[PDB]
Each structure stands twice: as structure tokens, then as C-alpha cells.
Design a protein around this nucleic acid. Structure first.
Length: 1209
RNA sequence: AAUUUCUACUGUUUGUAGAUCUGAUG
């Protein structure tokens, strides 16, 4: 009842796609006229015309450049040098970014408003690229493309004259090349941001004539290049617009690349013969399928082998890495963690080290902050090959982390460069096609390309997109041409990923236009002779009938009487009622019988927003009754059932256009005799298809498909009254040829017995008929992609409401329940439903999902046992690479079931679903569901609750297809998902997983041993450490005011006590190499090392007696036994057992063990991660209940506000 | 191991339960 008035709010369109079975002998008539082959060869020539148009774009780029005349190069020379203050970095980089913008305005200037090249362009719009003026190519590329009427060309361009609209999606991609914006696809990006910083960099190394000792030998470069390849194109700043074209850049890179070039001259005369000069970097040139097996075997025979790509250059360069200065070698912040994982330790060592030696210059005193911001993002990147830290306070002492780029290529070059022993099984035998096997001798080919991306990552640590002054130009000068060659492995490896991990079928379908350019662009109308397509009904099914070019006059005089007749749709429609009504406003005396000078001029200046800043009645009165009486005059919009409201009732012009939006769309059904229709389909005058999906079959008996329930709702008898759904124009009829053979796929024959895949079901069924795998792809079939529109006739909109409608409905409703969904470490997903008081209603894992209700039987499928079977499927080394996508295909398909489970949970409890915030709660551990996968779940949960209908519900209930729920905001804003989308809420997932859910206890202090000089000061901040002889456990009193990481919340005092058994988390060493989870017994181990190290513990208290012992293992193991106690979640080797045990007790005095017992409390450690998510949503409910003005309520959660709320509840 | 298409299937002897966009190189 919370979602009662949330039906029919905003309109959203969708596309419903079916098959088309050819009814009658119409497939033979289609094969007679050669429609399929015509559209097949046309979609074959589409690639060639696209390549011709790409060549035309290339020629247009080369003709457009050379007319720019940019004159800010000296100002960029002054401003850009000297690389603009990287310690300062704010206030001058902004003005440099403005200078880059005012420079890249000139690249898009000489065509827009310039008029040399005519701002409409006449050719980017694909309407008049074909058939204007009877020929257009006298100025255009056809004088190149003529070749005296070339036989491969011209004929291939003859098809795309009437069908010019195939390029309406292709021109959208080419429209981004000439963009003013700084998106990196543009032309002006690669000239001003790519090439221009590299041009000033390449010049300034060469402009050191008298700064270095190059005053003498500069001329002997210029005398040898006086024969050819003049350096004067590359030695002056004003000679940059010489090479704005593509033909200028290639002449420039011929000089720098060589073949004799300037790079080899300075290496032979100055380097080879203490100090070695740098090398210059070549500029960037400015603007596949891989289907056959012959291509990718010939591709990886020479495009990646030792002919083209050279790993001998990274060999000798990284062998002498120690000789170059490690001050000038730079490391970006993005690759700190990947550097620290591949070598020199763990994923968080260099983040610990860099912040460890930069936080000594900041002192948090006043505690708004203004110091913890500027210290963080600025100094975090050292940008040198680091000295591995001093760490003289004994922070995990180890050897150097700087000799590792030396050592990676020097790591037994047989092993680490494995291409040498993977060059023996090679060859290109004569082969058209082969089918992929699980393990042929191609596993060595993917492991050849496995080390390919590893070398690409080994050089990716020095990404360093600088633009920095003192960087080592000797190292980076060779590394600039080397890494840009080496960065094209990721594109090659992703394509052999796509080919070798293929399905046996193919999904390539070409659009059939039936010789008609405007086929199905509008439905049944006066203009049904243009669009050829009518819809028929035979009281069980819906038929798509297509006209013919010969006989377009069959349905003008059709028999209306008969038994068992086909109905025919009418579909009269007015498109754009606020747009088409001023398309009748412009008439001389056609509709303007009474054209007043008052009303016409008041429509011009005062037509926008109903008046020119006024709200009057009289001009709003004279406009409607002109339009109302104007509708009745012309015969086009006449005979419409326009039941208009009077002018006195409504004065808003938005209300008048709201009344003609439902009444503008009328669908009727007059019938036509069947034996008239059936007798002409066998002649060939009209084609009959049947719109067919699997629930239109006669054998079907289950619940119907979801999108079929929309298409059956298009032509219901309750769509005579005000329509909710709407049939849209511009449909399309695809055709998919046979991509599979019968004998190729494994089939199950007649009388064969089959075993059930799921571990629960043991039964076996006989199946007397044959079952063919991929029966859809065995035989070729048509398609039809019908677009529909829901809530047509409603005018409302998106987030302009500021979610006032959702928030107001929550406050008037009483006793709302909260739903929290979070990831699990041992569960796939976990759910917990919480009332307003804060107690669990139900808590159930999503490992097992039971919605499978065929006819009252429920089938529970284990998705955890399937993922166990998928994980061993990926374990096999000698196998293909495509089993990693089968798990991603499953997780994309598993979450589609989960979206159903939540939408039935929301209806049962009138609940609110609260998910984690991926923007600032994304820092998480390892999980069974990834982070890029979980965004697809959080996106598909929005698109479902846009138009939520329940299939089993009757049509009277709220939630059927008649009354569809509109629970979330419209998905036009798909990127910005912040803190609210309708009923969905988004809370930060930090500090939710490990909290004692009874008392709200989180470990705010972190016991970590760094130095024993201040480990004495750590234990001295404890209030009282004693031993309870009567109770039986130790007593670590604390006070969070004395420690650091100060917390504003309540309960600054605590009482850490010991227990019976704490199954310790995985902590292992090379020697410890074991099952790696060694469970500890803390309370007797605290009785240990006290009698061992000769310290009495009977005296209350014994907090200062810890501080007089410096055994170096007493203070170290007291950290190990306190890190066990303060960690709250515990995971053992037994995978079924995962739990939470808390040190601190309640007010009553019992401790929380999640295993014993489960009384309306979180069952395990995965339930607690979902219980504290829904507690964060309970606080967002308590803000709305405490909001007297709901306009600007901020639902954000501070970290101390949640801690103060969780433990004072 | 059957589907407009995806996922899990066997879920009355040519099928069952969810989900499903639309246009398109990284």
C-alpha cells in the first residue's frame, strides 16, 4: 500500500523482438523475387561503401587542414615552459587548461562560421552524399574515385541511393572527430594535446644549441641532412603548422624515425664513441572482425612474432637499468600498487611507506580540517625509483626494491622470455577453418600471448604521462618509441580472446528492406502504401502482413463479411501535438479563415511558455478555440473522437496539449474475410508472417513471457478506453542465415536416457522425440523488432520532483520495513529485512533461490554448487582460455534471477531496498561477486523497477500490466547513481561488516607493531589490564581519548575480555606453508608468555608491568593476541563455518557469539554485513520521519554519526 | 539439453522459471 499511487507516472519506451514464421506459400515467393539475396549483397557492399566514405573523411581532413592559421604558439611556448610548477599545480594549470581550450577552438574554427568550408559541410549529413544534382563528385572524391568509370567502384555505390539512411548510425561516430570538446576521440585533441606537447618537447631537446656543448657538432648534422630531410622543418617553433596535415607528420617522422635519420646520426657521431644525448620521439598520426581461422593464424604468424615486434629492445635497455639515474626515472601514482604487488611485497606496502614518510610534516591540532586534504593528493607520488624507505624503526626490513626492473629480464631468460621455447610448434598450413577444441596444441599459443601482456605490464609501471622537467631523457627518449609500440598488445590479445572463445553459432543478421527504403517507418495509415506493412489477427495469434510493389490496392475494396475473418488494424495517429499543431498554423488561407493580426502576433512574441513572461487568460482563450475549430475543418485530423474540455475549465496550454496526447492515438480493428486473404498469398500478391515467440506455441502451458505480455496488451479491448501502451513506428525485419549444421552439434536421439545436471534432482526422462542442440541456429529464420511505448499520454518527468513523491509517501505511510543487500565472502549475496524498531524479520542467503513455480511445484537450484563446479572448470591449466567467460556469463545471468527475488520482497513487506554506494564504499576485500559485475546488478535493479509488473497477479491488483509500478527514477541518467533512486537508497559500505551487532563495537584502534620505543607508550594508554580469577578471562580496558584516531561518538570506554575459541583468520609464512588457518586459543595463550617471560599477573593492575619488559617477543606477541581479539569476524578452513565473536559484553553481561545462538540476530558473518547495511537505511528512514521540510534534506552518512547511532539504539 | 535473445535447466510426449535492451570498433 506504500506503492499504491506509484502507477502511471512517466513514459518509457522499449523494443519487443519476435520471430516471423512464413505462413502459407510465401517463403517460396520471397525466394522467387530474391529479396534475401538482394539485402545480403547490399549488407555485403555496406562495408565497402563505409571504407570509401572513410577515405572521403581522410581526404576531407587533409583538405581542411592547412587553413587554420593558429597564432598562439609563442604564447604557448612562454606559458607551457617550464612545465608549469608541479608542486604548485593549482591556479596555473587551470590557465594552461584555458590556453589549451582557446588553442583547440581554432582547429574547429575554420569550418564553422568561416565559410571557406561552409559550416553545414554539405556531406557529413548523409542525405545528399548520394543522388544530389544527379552527381556531386565533381568537387568531391569522385574525381579520384572515377578511374574512368572504375569497375569495382561506382557499381558498389549504385545501391545506396534510395537507402541513404543506413549511415545514420555511422555518421554519429564520424561527427565526433570534428568536435570542439576535449574528449580524446577528436581531431583537435590529437593535434593540440597529443602532438603539440610532444613537438615542444622534441624541439627543446634539439634547441639546446649553446646550453650544452652542442655548439660545435650541430652543423655536421645539418650538412649531412642538407642532401635530404631538412632539419629546418623540425628546429623552429613557427614551423609547426607545416605538419598539421597527415602528409606533414609523416615527413616529420621520416626525419625522427629515419631511413638515414637524425636519431641515428646523433647516436653514431656523439653516443657510440660519460654523457649521452637523448633521442627524439615521433609524433602521432591523426585518424575488426577476425572471423576466419586463416586470418588469426596468419596474424599471429607475423604481426606479433619476431619479424614485427621486437622484445630485444626492452632486453638490452632494461639490462642496463642501473646505469641511468634513478632520480630521473618516474613512477605515476596509478601504478604504485601494481608495482608493489608484482615485486617488493604486498598490495599496500608502498601506500604505507609513502604516507609513512610524508605525514611527519603535518600535525592535526584543531580538527574544517584543511590540512589532511592538501597533504594527501599532492605528496603521495614520490615519482622516483624509491629508496625503499629508511625504516630505521624496524618496519619489516628487507632488500632493495630498485634492482627489480634490472632483474625481471635477468630472471633466467629462458623462463621469463618464453617466446624462445614457444617458437618450435609453428607453421601456416593450408587451412580454411577449424573448430576450437578444449585442449589442442593451441594452449601454448594463448600462453605465448599470456607472457605478452605481462611484458606490457612490466613497462606499464613507468606510464608517466609527463610533462615533467628533470626526468631522465636518456631513458625516456628510447622508451617513448618503445612503449607506444608495446602498448598495442592489449588490443591484439583482446581480439584473440574474442575469436578463440567463440560460440559454435553466429549472430550476424542483415536488415531486410524488401526493396522499400521507408519499410515499416510508420504503421497502418493513409501512408500504408509507402510503408507496406499491416497487422492481422486470427483470434489466437497476431500476423504481420507485408504488401507488394505490384499490388498495393488490395485493402481498399476488401470483403468485410464472413465467418472466421482476419481483423485489420487502423492506427490513425497525430505525432507531436505541441509540434504538429504549429505545422497547420502556417497557412495563407487554407486553415486561416480567421487570421487576426492580434492573435498571430501574440503567438510569435508571446507563444513560448504560454506568454512572453505573463500568464493571461485572453490570448490563451483565443489560441485554443482557433485550434479547436481548426481541427474540425481539415479532413486529416477530422473523424477523430476528440472529446475536448471547454476553454473555461483549463487555461494552461500544457493542459491542452496533455488532453490531445491520448486522444491523438487511435487504434481500431475492422475485419476482412479470410478466404480472400488466403487465396492471394498463394498467388504472391501479399506476404503473410506470424509474429511468434515460444509462448504462442500450441503445446505451451506455463506462464507467458514478459515481453509477450506487453505485445498482447497492445491490442486488448481495454485499449479502446484510454491507452497505456503504444505501438511505435520505425520497426525492422532482420534475417539470420543458417550458421550451424545438424551433425555438428551433439544431439540426444530417440529413446536415449538423460541425467539431470542439478545435484538435487535424481530422476531421468525418456524423451521419445529427438532433441537437437541449438535448434534455433540450425535453420535460418526471420526476426521482427517491434518498438513499444508505455504510459503514453502522461506528461510527468524525472528527478525535477527531487524525489518529493517518494519521500512524502514514506512519511504518510506507517511502519515501513527496510531491506539491506550486501555482498558476501562465503555467500554469493545475502539479504536481511529490518523493521522500524531494528529487529530482523527474515534473513536468508541467495545461494539457494526458489521462485521456480511451474504449476505449484517449487524447484530450488543451488547456485553455490554450480560456482564450485565452475571454479574447478577454470582450474584446468591445459585447457582453453574461454572458461573464464562462462562464469561471467553465469553471474550476468544469476543476477537476473536475484532482481526478481528483491522485487517480490519489496511487495511483501512494503519495504525499502538499501544497497551499498559504489562511489565511496567501493574499497572492499575479496568477494565471490566482483565490483564491475555488481554495478550491472545495481543498474538492472533500476531498470526493472522503472516498469515493474507481476506476471501471476490479476489485472485488478496494483502491480499487473494494467497498473505497472514506477518505483525508481528513469534511466536516462544512467551514470549518476547517488544516494537515492526512488525507493532505492545508497549507503557507504565502510564500517558495516565487522561490528558487534549487540553493543555496536568496532575496533577503532589498530594494534600493529612498528617500533618498540613507542610500543611502551601504546600499552601505557590502557586504563587497566588485569586478570579475573573468578570470571576466567583477561581485561583490556581502553579509552579512545588517550589513543589516536579520535572518535566523537559515545562509548569511549570499553572492556575487551577473552573467550573459549577464536578460529583465527588466514595468516601464513613460507615455513608456515600449510592449510594456513591456525586457530588460536587466546585465554590460555595469555596465560602463556607471562609465566614464560617471568612477569607475574596476579597483581591488579599490571599495565605498567608490561612496559618494563623489552624482550622484543613479548611486545610483539601481545600485538598478535590483541589483533586476534579486536578482529571481530572469524573464518576457518571448514567452509560452512564462518562467524563473529565479540570481546565486549552487553549491559546484561553475556557475549555475542553468532553461532550460539540465533534468536532474531545475524546468523553468521555474512548476515552481519547485510544487517548493518539495513541499519544504515533505518537511519535514512529516521531522517525522513524527523523532516518537517523535505525539500533539501541531505541523506549523507558521516562516519561518526553512524557509530553514534548504532550503539545508542 | 529444445528459447526473439541471455541464464539455469528438464521444469506434462516438440517444453519450465526468471530476465531482455536496442542500434553498432578499444
Amino acid at each position: 500500500m506504500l506503492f499504491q499511487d506509484f502507477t502511471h507516472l512517466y513514459p518509457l519506451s522499449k523494443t519487443v523482438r519476435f520471430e516471423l514464421k512464413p505462413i502459407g506459400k510465401t517463403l517460396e515467393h520471397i525466394h522467387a523475387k530474391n529479396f534475401l539475396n538482394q539485402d545480403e549483397t547490399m549488407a555485403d557492399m555496406y562495408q565497402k561503401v563505409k571504407a570509401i566514405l572513410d577515405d572521403y573523411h581522410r581526404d576531407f581532413i587533409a583538405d581542411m587542414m592547412g587553413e587554420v592559421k593558429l597564432t598562439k604558439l609563442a604564447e604557448f611556448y612562454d606559458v607551457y615552459l617550464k612545465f608549469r610548477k608541479n608542486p604548485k599545480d593549482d591556479g596555473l594549470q587551470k590557465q594552461l587548461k584555458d590556453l589549451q581550450a582557446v588553442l583547440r577552438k581554432e582547429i574547429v574554427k575554420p569550418i564553422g562560421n568561416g565559410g571557406k568550408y561552409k559550416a553545414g559541410y554539405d556531406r557529413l549529413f548523409g542525405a545528399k552524399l548520394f543522388k544530389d544534382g544527379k552527381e556531386l563528385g565533381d568537387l568531391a572524391k569522385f574525381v579520384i574515385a572515377q578511374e574512368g568509370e572504375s569497375s569495382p567502384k561506382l557499381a558498389h555505390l549504385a545501391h545506396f541511393e534510395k537507402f541513404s539512411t543506413y549511415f545514420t548510425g555511422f555518421h554519429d561516430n564520424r561527427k565526433n572527430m570534428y568536435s570542439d570538446e576535449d574528449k580524446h576521440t577528436a581531431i583537435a585533441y590529437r593535434l593540440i594535446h597529443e602532438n603539440l606537447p610532444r613537438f615542444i618537447d622534441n624541439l627543446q631537446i634539439l634547441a639546446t644549441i649553446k646550453q650544452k656543448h652542442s655548439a660545435l657538432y650541430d652543423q655536421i648534422i645539418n650538412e649531412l641532412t642538407a642532401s635530404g630531410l631538412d632539419v629546418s622543418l623540425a628546429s623552429h617553433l613557427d614551423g609547426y603548422h607545416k605538419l598539421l596535415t597527415q602528409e606533414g607528420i609523416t615527413a616529420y617522422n621520416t626525419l625522427l624515425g629515419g631511413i638515414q635519420g637524425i636519431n641515428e646520426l646523433i647516436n653514431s657521431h656523439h653516443n657510440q664513441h660519460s654523457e649521452r644525448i637523448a633521442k627524439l620521439r615521433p609524433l602521432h598520426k591523426q585518424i575488426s572482425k577476425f572471423a576466419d581461422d586463416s586470418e588469426v593464424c596468419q596474424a599471429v604468424n607475423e604481426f606479433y612474432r619476431h619479424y614485427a615486434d621486437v622484445f630485444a629492445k626492452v632486453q638490452s635497455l632494461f639490462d642496463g637499468f642501473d646505469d641511468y639515474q634513478k632520480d630521473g626515472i618516474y613512477v605515476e601514482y596509478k601504478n604504485l600498487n601494481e608495482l608493489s604487488k608484482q615485486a617488493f611485497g604486498d598490495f599496500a606496502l608502498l601506500g604505507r611507506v609513502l604516507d609513512g614518510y610524508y605525514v611527519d610534516v603535518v600535525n592535526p591540532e584543531f580538527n574544517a580540517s584543511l590540512e589532511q586534504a592538501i597533504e594527501h593528493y599532492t605528496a603521495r607520488h614520490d615519482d622516483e625509483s624509491v629508496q625503499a624507505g629508511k625504516l630505521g624503526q624496524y618496519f619489516k626490513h628487507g632488500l632493495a626494491g630498485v634492482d627489480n626492473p634490472i632483474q625481471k629480464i635477468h630472471n633466467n631468460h629462458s623462463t621469463i622470455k618464453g617466446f624462445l621455447e614457444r617458437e618450435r610448434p609453428a607453421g601456416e598450413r593450408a587451412l580454411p577453418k577449424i573448430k576450437s577444441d578444449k585442449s589442442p596444441e593451441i594452449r601454448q599459443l594463448k600462453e605465448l600471448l599470456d607472457n605478452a601482456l605481462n611484458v606490457a605490464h612490466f613497462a606499464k609501471l613507468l606510464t608517466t604521462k609527463t610533462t615533467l622537467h628533470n626526468q631522465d631523457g636518456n631513458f625516456y627518449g628510447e622508451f617513448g618509441a618503445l612503449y607506444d609500440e608495446l602498448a598495442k598488445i592489449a588490443t591484439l590479445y583482446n581480439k584473440v580472446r574474442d575469436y578463440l572463445s567463440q560460440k559454435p553459432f553466429s549472430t550476424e543478421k542483415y536488415k531486410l528492406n524488401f526493396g522499400n527504403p521507408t519499410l515499416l517507418n510508420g504503421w497502418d495509415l493513409n501512408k500504408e502504401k509507402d510503408n507496406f506493412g499491416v497487422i492481422l489477427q486470427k483470434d489466437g495469434c497476431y500476423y504481420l502482413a507485408l504488401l507488394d510493389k505490384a499490388h498495393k490496392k488490395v485493402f481498399d475494396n476488401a470483403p468485410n463479411t464472413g465467418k472466421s475473418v482476419y481483423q485489420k488494424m487502423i492506427y490513425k495517429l497525430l505525432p507531436g501535438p505541441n509540434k504538429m499543431l504549429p505545422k497547420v498554423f502556417f497557412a495563407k488561407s487554407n486553415l486561416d479563415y480567421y487570421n487576426p493580426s492580434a492573435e498571430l502576433l501574440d503567438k510569435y512574441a508571446q507563444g513560448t511558455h504560454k506568454k512572453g513572461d505573463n500568464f493571461n487568460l485572453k490570448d490563451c482563450h483565443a489560441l485554443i478555440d482557433f485550434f479547436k475549430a481548426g481541427i474540425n475543418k481539415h479532413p486529416e485530423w477530422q473523424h477523430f473522437g476528440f472529446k475536448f474540455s471547454p476553454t473555461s475549465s483549463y487555461q494552461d496550454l500544457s493542459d491542452f496539449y496533455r488532453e490531445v496526447e491520448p486522444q491523438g492515438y487511435q487504434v481500431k480493428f475492422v475485419d476482412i474475410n479470410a478466404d480472400y486473404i488466403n487465396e492471394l498469398v498463394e498467388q504472391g500478391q501479399l506476404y503473410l508472417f506470424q509474429i511468434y515467440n515460444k509462448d504462442f506455441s500450441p503445446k505451451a502451458h506455463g506462464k507467458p513471457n514478459l515481453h509477450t505480455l506487453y505485445f498482447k496488451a497492445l491490442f486488448s479491448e481495454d485499449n479502446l478506453v484510454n491507452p497505456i501502451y503504444k505501438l511505435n513506428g520505425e520497426a525492422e525485419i532482420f534475417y539470420r542465415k543458417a550458421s550451424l549444421d545438424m551433425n555438428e552439434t551433439t544431439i540426444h536421439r530417440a529413446g536415449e536416457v538423460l541425467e539431470n545436471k542439478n545435484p538435487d534432482n535424481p530422476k531421468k526422462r525418456q524423451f521419445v522425440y529427438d532433441i537437437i542442440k541449438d535448434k534455433r541456429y540450425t535453420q535460418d529464420k526471420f526476426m521482427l523488432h517491434v518498438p513499444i511505448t508505455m504510459n503514453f499520454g502522461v506528461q510527468g518527468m524525472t528527478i525535477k520532483e527531487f524525489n518529493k513523491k517518494v519521500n512524502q509517501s514514506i512519511q504518510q505511510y506507517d511502519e515501513v520495513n527496510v531491506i539491506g543487500i550486501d555482498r558476501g565472502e562465503r555467500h554469493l549475496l545475502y539479504l536481511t529485512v529490518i523493521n522500524s524498531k531494528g529487529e530482523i524479520l527474515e534473513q536468508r542467503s541467495l545461494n539457494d533461490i526458489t521462485t521456480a513455480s511451474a504449476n505449484g511445484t517449487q524447484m530450488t537450484t543451488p547456485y553455490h554448487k554450480i560456482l564450485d563446479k565452475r571454479e574447478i572448470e577454470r582450474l584446468n591449466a591445459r585447457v582453453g582460455w574461454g572458461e573464464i567467460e562462462t562464469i561471467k556469463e553465469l553471474k550476468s545471468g544469476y543476477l537476473s534471477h536475484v532482481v526478481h527475488q528483491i522485487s517480490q520482497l519489496m511487495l511483501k513487506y512494503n519495504a525499502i531496498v538499501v544497497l551499498e554506494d559504489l562511489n565511496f564504499g567501493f574499497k572492499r576485500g575479496c568477494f565471490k561477486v566482483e565490483k564491475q559485475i555488481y554495478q550491472n546488478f545495481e543498474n538492472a535493479l533500476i531498470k526493472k523497477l522503472n516498469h515493474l509488473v507481476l506476471k501471476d497477479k490479476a489485472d485488478d491488483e496494483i502491480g499487473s500490466y494494467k497498473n505497472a509500478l514506477q518505483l525508481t527514477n528513469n534511466f536516462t541518467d544512467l551514470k549518476s547513481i547517488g544516494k537515492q533512486t526512488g525507493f532505492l537508497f545508497y549507503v557507504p559500505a565502510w564500517n558495516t561488516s565487522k561490528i558487534d551487532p549487540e553493543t555496536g563495537f568496532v575496533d577503532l584502534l589498530k594494534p600493529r607493531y612498528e617500533n618498540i620505543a613507542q610500543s611502551q607508550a601504546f600499552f601505557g594508554k590502557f586504563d587497566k589490564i588485569c586478570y579475573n580469577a573468578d570470571r576466567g578471562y583477561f581485561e583490556f580496558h581502553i579509552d579512545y581519548a588517550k589513543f589516536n584516531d579520535k572518535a566523537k561518538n559515545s562509548r569511549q570506554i570499553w572492556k575487551i575480555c577473552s573467550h573459549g575459541d577464536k578460529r583465527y583468520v588466514y595468516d601464513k609464512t613460507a615455513n608456515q606453508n600449510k592449510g594456513a588457518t591456525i586457530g588460536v586459543n587466546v585465554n590460555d595463550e595469555l596465560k602463556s608468555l607471562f609465566t614464560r617471560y617471568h612477569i607475574n599477573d596476579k597483581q591488579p593492575n599490571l599495565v605498567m608491568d608490561i612496559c618494563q619488559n623489552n624482550d622484543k617477543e613479548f611486545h610483539k606477541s601481545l600485538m598478535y593476541l590483541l589483533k586476534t581479539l579486536l578482529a571481530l569476524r572469524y573464518s576457518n578452513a571448514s567452509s560452512d563455518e564462518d562467524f563473529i565473536l565479540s570481546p565486549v559484553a552487553n549491559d546484561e553481561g553475556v557475549f555475542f557469539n553468532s553461532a550460539l545462538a540465533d534468536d532474531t540476530q545475524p546468523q553468521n558473518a555474512d548476515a552481519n554485513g547485510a544487517y548493518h547495511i539495513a541499519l544504515k537505511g533505518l537511519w535514512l528512514l529516521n531522517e525522513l520521519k524527523n523532516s518537517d521540510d523535505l525539500n533539501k534534506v541531505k541523506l549523507a552518512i558521516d562516519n561518526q554519526t553512524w557509530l553514534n547511532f548504532a550503539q545508542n539504539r
